[PDB]
Design a protein around this motif. Structure first.
Motif, PDB file in Angstrom:
ATOM      1  N   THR A  67     -19.141  47.661  98.055  1.00 16.49           N
ATOM      2  CA  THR A  67     -18.910  47.086  99.372  1.00 16.49           C
ATOM      3  C   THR A  67     -19.539  47.989 100.420  1.00 16.49           C
ATOM      4  OG1 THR A  67     -16.802  46.200  98.568  1.00 16.49           O
ATOM      5  CG2 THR A  67     -17.186  46.124 100.935  1.00 16.49           C
ATOM      6  N   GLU A  68     -19.962  47.377 101.531  1.00  7.24           N
ATOM      7  CA  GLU A  68     -20.564  48.136 102.624  1.00  7.24           C
ATOM      8  C   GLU A  68     -19.614  49.205 103.148  1.00  7.24           C
ATOM      9  OE1 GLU A  68     -21.400  44.445 104.865  1.00  7.24           O
ATOM     10  OE2 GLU A  68     -19.775  45.001 106.227  1.00  7.24           O
ATOM     11  N   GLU A  69     -18.314  48.915 103.165  1.00  4.27           N
ATOM     12  CA  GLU A  69     -17.345  49.871 103.693  1.00  4.27           C
ATOM     13  C   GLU A  69     -16.965  50.911 102.647  1.00  4.27           C
ATOM     14  OE1 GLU A  69     -16.364  50.122 106.787  1.00  4.27           O
ATOM     15  OE2 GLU A  69     -17.627  48.425 107.368  1.00  4.27           O
ATOM     16  N   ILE A  84     -19.649  42.864  96.933  1.00  3.05           N
ATOM     17  CA  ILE A  84     -18.812  42.098  97.841  1.00  3.05           C
ATOM     18  C   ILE A  84     -19.294  42.313  99.265  1.00  3.05           C
ATOM     19  CG2 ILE A  84     -16.451  41.521  98.463  1.00  3.05           C
ATOM     20  CD1 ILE A  84     -16.924  41.279  95.554  1.00  3.05           C
ATOM     21  N   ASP A  85     -19.388  41.226 100.022  1.00  4.01           N
ATOM     22  CA  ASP A  85     -19.462  41.295 101.478  1.00  4.01           C
ATOM     23  C   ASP A  85     -18.373  40.375 102.002  1.00  4.01           C
ATOM     24  OD1 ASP A  85     -19.939  41.518 104.147  1.00  4.01           O
ATOM     25  OD2 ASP A  85     -21.912  40.570 104.126  1.00  4.01           O
ATOM     26  N   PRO A  86     -17.269  40.932 102.500  1.00  5.77           N
ATOM     27  CA  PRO A  86     -16.228  40.093 103.100  1.00  5.77           C
ATOM     28  C   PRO A  86     -16.684  39.398 104.362  1.00  5.77           C
ATOM     29  CG  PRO A  86     -15.440  42.320 102.607  1.00  5.77           C
ATOM     30  CD  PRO A  86     -16.924  42.357 102.545  1.00  5.77           C
ATOM     31  N   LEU A  87     -17.883  39.698 104.849  1.00  4.09           N
ATOM     32  CA  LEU A  87     -18.419  39.014 106.015  1.00  4.09           C
ATOM     33  C   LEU A  87     -19.923  39.220 106.055  1.00  4.09           C
ATOM     34  CD1 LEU A  87     -16.721  37.363 107.875  1.00  4.09           C
ATOM     35  CD2 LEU A  87     -17.079  39.073 109.648  1.00  4.09           C
ATOM     36  N   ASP A  88     -20.660  38.129 106.215  1.00  2.12           N
ATOM     37  CA  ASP A  88     -22.089  38.171 106.497  1.00  2.12           C
ATOM     38  C   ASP A  88     -22.286  37.551 107.872  1.00  2.12           C
ATOM     39  OD1 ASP A  88     -24.823  38.246 106.585  1.00  2.12           O
ATOM     40  OD2 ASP A  88     -25.135  36.675 105.094  1.00  2.12           O
ATOM     41  N   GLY A  89     -22.736  38.357 108.823  1.00  2.00           N
ATOM     42  CA  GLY A  89     -22.880  37.879 110.178  1.00  2.00           C
ATOM     43  C   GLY A  89     -21.685  38.238 111.030  1.00  2.00           C
ATOM     44  N   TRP A 212     -26.123  44.510  99.226  1.00  2.00           N
ATOM     45  CA  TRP A 212     -24.993  43.606  99.080  1.00  2.00           C
ATOM     46  C   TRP A 212     -25.027  42.453 100.065  1.00  2.00           C
ATOM     47  CZ3 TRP A 212     -23.998  49.001  99.376  1.00  2.00           C
ATOM     48  CH2 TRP A 212     -23.999  49.501 100.683  1.00  2.00           C
ATOM     49  N   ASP A 213     -26.182  42.154 100.648  1.00  2.00           N
ATOM     50  CA  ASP A 213     -26.334  40.989 101.504  1.00  2.00           C
ATOM     51  C   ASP A 213     -27.189  39.906 100.867  1.00  2.00           C
ATOM     52  OD1 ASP A 213     -24.996  42.745 103.110  1.00  2.00           O
ATOM     53  OD2 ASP A 213     -26.148  42.276 104.919  1.00  2.00           O
ATOM     54  N   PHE A 214     -27.739  40.155  99.683  1.00  3.72           N
ATOM     55  CA  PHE A 214     -28.485  39.145  98.949  1.00  3.72           C
ATOM     56  C   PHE A 214     -28.079  39.019  97.492  1.00  3.72           C
ATOM     57  CE2 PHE A 214     -31.189  43.008  99.095  1.00  3.72           C
ATOM     58  CZ  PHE A 214     -31.098  43.364  97.768  1.00  3.72           C
TER      59      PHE A 214
HETATM   60 MG   LIG Z   1     -21.472  42.321 105.243  1.00  2.00          MG
END
Ligand SMILES: [Mg+2]
Lengths: 267, 99, 178
Positions: A67-69, A84-89, A212-214
DNA sequence: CCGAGCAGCATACATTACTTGTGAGCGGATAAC
DNA sequence: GTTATCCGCTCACAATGCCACACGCGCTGCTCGG
RNA sequence: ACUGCUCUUUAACAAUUUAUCAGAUCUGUGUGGGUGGCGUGUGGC
């Protein structure tokens, strides 16, 4: 039937997206903080990431998570990863622009096996499992059957984190505007990839995207007839973060067009 | 059983009788072929083999043979012809004494 | 001290055990009970005692192959090859065999030990896959395997009971496809 | 205990088999510096 | 000796069109089955 | 045979910072839908 890990992932993404929608209608509960360039990150990110991690560990207490975080949470095993990305954008959710998604994919031996993205605002659920294909709410996905760079629509992203390429990037877009019809810009890499796999846009490309965005969308566009590559036709896109994707004809045409406009730093 | 039955039933040589006419039946029973297992095929036949050899006189009919891709391969055995003890084609002949 | 390094021979589809029997018989023929010391065909057992296939099933580590502990001499080479139904050796260039290395030897030995110690039910279930129920009390239900278990072997399974999902302990025999 | 499906088997072997006519790549003998 | 030269060695690769008719088309001992 | 000797009167709460004055539609089942692949052989022209 339905791929098992795919079922767990889609349940988790459903719960995360429900939490997202819950946080959406309250422009008060969001308490964000800036972390990068022209973008915040909210407490909602942490809440959704927590929900996803917990739901995963419920039925998989040993899988590695990315995850990014939280960077990389190395579970007791290290062959099954969950990107995992719990949010894109997150930028859009800040301004409450109703266009975002949650994204969850599973890597086995480095190969993405299942992937889902979820737009809670339109209740769209792009699922995709390797060797079986991609589905939109129960319909197959074949990507735009366009055969050339004419009349096509090109989804893209501007490098708000690496604006140095902008000029180069600009030229690229300029060159592309010589042939293609129109562009698209939603500030959501995963949904761009989905739309490509959905046949809604006939091609996508971005300079310097996060891993983790694609990793979820790339399997979608793969199993939806499309192909992905870097800007030089190679497979190093997972490291450079430089992505092009779409049906083979339009990808080949885009690469042929961009072979010159591009810069040597990207190749 | 499998070998003998696949032979008598599905052979390059064996085939349903040409049974639409007595003459056809006979000439199909006493018919001499050159194809089959251990025998040449119509592809690699060669213009040489088909022609009648001057020893065909009385041992194999020179006039009856199917016209087309297999001439001279399929042959009709002569009227008085008869196989030998070893397997050759012996023909009768009238013994002539001194005069 | 030239040890009898292990070797492997390619058998046919399903004659491996019979090939090993006939090979031991050819050993008793040529009295080569020294050179052809050991000959082995490994196997496994999956124990699903309900749902069609009953109470056991036999698998192989790798089919079509048989393992021996021969030595390297042209006579023994033929004696291996001069048996009813085998293809050639499996190794280096044909007419010059190569031995399965001792590392692989002890590896397959440990595998054989593990499969011989514990007869264990394979054909398991993976956490998060939907499945029907062939149980009496819960006939014609269907739920998702919320957590799998092996020694207890009772398939913690979530399913719609009184509305919301509930976890149950429906045992293996009460589990349908997947 | 045998009836009904199956998974990878040249039946294990010596199967096998005269010319077909032509081009083309190839490996062992060959002339030269 | 080597470097290029050449000549026999072995293998790939073609064999008129149709029509009609006929015949056949795994199996088998291991595996699923009561 | 040989630890045990009243503790004092049924739950102890979430929702919470602009903005408001509450502010068109319940019809079907007209209509169709509901032998061959290969091989080989044989002949013919
Ligand atoms: Mg994200």
């Amino acid at each position: 039937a339905m791929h098992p890990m795919l079922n767990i992932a889609v349940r988790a993404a459903r719960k995360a997206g429900n939490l997202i929608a819950k946080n959406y209608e309250t422009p008060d509960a969001v308490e964000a903080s800036q972390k990068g360039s022209n973008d915040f990150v909210t407490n909602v990110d942490k809440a959704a990431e927590a929900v996803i991690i917990d739901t995963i560990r419920k039925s998989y207490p040993q899988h590695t998570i990315i995850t990014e975080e939280s960077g990389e949470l190395e579970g007791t095993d290290q062959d099954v990863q969950w990107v995992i990305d719990p949010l894109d954008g997150t930028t859009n959710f800040i301004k409450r622009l109703p266009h975002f998604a949650v994204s969850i994919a599973v890597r086995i031996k480095g190969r993405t096996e299942v992937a889902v993205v979820y737009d809670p605002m339109r209740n769209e659920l792009f699922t995709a499992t390797r060797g079986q294909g991609a589905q939109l709410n129960g319909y197959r996905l074949r990507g735009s059957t366009a055969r050339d760079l004419d009349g096509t629509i090109l989804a893209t992203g501007f490098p708000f984190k690496a604006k140095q390429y902008a000029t180069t990037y600009i030229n690229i877009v300029g060159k592309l505007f010589n042939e293609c019809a129109d562009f698209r810009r939603t500030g959501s890499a995963a949904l761009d990839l989905a739309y490509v796999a959905a046949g809604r846009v006939d091609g996508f490309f971005e300079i310097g995207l996060r891993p983790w965005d694609f990793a979820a969308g790339e399997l979608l566009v793969r199993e939806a007839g499309g192909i992905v590559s870097d800007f030089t036709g190679g497979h190093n896109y997972m490291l450079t973060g430089n992505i092009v994707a779409g049906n083979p004809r339009v990808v080949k045409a885009m690469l042929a067009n961009m072979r010159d406009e591009l810069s040597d730093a990207l190749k | 059983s499998a070998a003998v039955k696949e032979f008598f039933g599905s052979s390059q040589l064996s085939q349903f009788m040409d049974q639409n006419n007595p003459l056809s039946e006979i000439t199909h029973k006493r018919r001499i072929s050159a194809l089959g297992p251990g025998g040449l095929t119509r592809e690699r036949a060669g213009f040489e083999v088909r022609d009648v050899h001057p020893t065909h006189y009385g041992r194999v009919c020179p006039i009856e043979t199917p016209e087309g891709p297999n001439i001279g391969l399929i042959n009709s055995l002569s009227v008085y012809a008869q196989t030998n003890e070893y397997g050759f084609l012996e023909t009768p002949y009238r013994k002539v004494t001194d005069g | 001290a030239p040890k009898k390094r292990w070797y492997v021979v390619q058998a046919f589809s399903g004659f491996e055990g019979r090939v090993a029997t006939s090979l031991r018989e050819h050993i008793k023929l040529h009295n080569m009970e020294d050179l052809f010391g050991e000959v082995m065909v490994p196997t496994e057992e999956v124990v699903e005692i309900r749902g069609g296939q009953r109470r056991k099933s036999e698998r192989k580590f790798f089919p079509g192959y048989v393992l021996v502990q021969m030595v390297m001499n042209d006579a023994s080479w033929h004696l291996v090859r001069s048996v009813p139904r085998v293809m050639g050796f499996i190794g280096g260039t044909s007419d010059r065999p190569a031995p399965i290395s001792d590392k692989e030897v002890d590896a397959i030995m440990n595998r054989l030990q593990q499969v011989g110690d514990k007869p264990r039910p394979k054909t398991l279930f993976e956490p998060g896959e939907m499945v029907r129920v062939n149980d009496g009390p819960f006939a014609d239900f269907n739920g998702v395997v919320e957590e799998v278990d092996y020694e207890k072997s009772r398939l913690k399974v979530s399913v719609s009971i009184f509305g919301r999902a509930t976890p149950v302990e429906l045992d293996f025999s009460q589990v349908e496809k997947a």
